[PDB]
Amino acid sequence: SMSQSNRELVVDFLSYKLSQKGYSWSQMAAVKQALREAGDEFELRYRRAFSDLTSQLHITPGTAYQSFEQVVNELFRDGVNWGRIVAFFSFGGALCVESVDKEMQVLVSRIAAWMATYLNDHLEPWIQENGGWDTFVELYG
């Protein structure tokens, strides 16, 4: 496990250094990087929407399950687009931070599963029809 962990650290570091020069380790690393940046950008440009939602997540005694469903269903109520997909990831991120703040980091494993399930079951048909994650990479960069 020590040999495969070292291989993982090499891959992660090299992916990073390549991305700083506008190159990519792989198709997957290019997707991870563009999404990391689009998330940061969305959070900075929509600072007001981000801050209002995070205040509500902090205040609510409601379950992370309920907050997840309320927000995600409202977000995709009018359909799927790349910008809304970025906001979905940003929301997941905020929900995980809030869970850790409340000493409920166990909820992070649950949020990650709900995100992967929502992506696989409700976002993947639109994603594939619209060029896949490679098209998002091209649109963002």
Ligand X SMILES: Cc1ccc(CN(C(=O)N[C@@H](CS(=O)(=O)CC2CCCCC2)C(=O)O)C(=O)c2ccc3c(c2)CCN(Cc2ccccc2-c2ccc(Cl)cc2)C3)cc1
For a second copy, the binding residues (CB under 8 A) are 2-3, 5-14, 16-18, 21, 23, 25, 28, 31-32, 35-36, 39, 89-90, 92-94, 96-97, 100-101, 105, 108, 111-112, 115-116, 119-120, 124, 133
With CB under 6 A as the rule, give the number of residues binding ligand X. Answer: 23
* CA nearest neighbour of 38 among 81, 70, 85: 85
Q: Which member of 7, 17, 36, 45 binds ligand X (CB under 6 A)? A: 45
Residue 57 near ligand X by CB under 6 A: no
Distance CA 75, CA 91 (A): 10
Residue 133 near ligand X by CB under 6 A: no
Residue 89 near ligand X by CB under 6 A: no
Q: How far is CA 123 from CA 15, 24, 86, in A?
A: 26, 25, 12
CA end-to-end span of the chain:
36
Tokens of 120: 């696989």
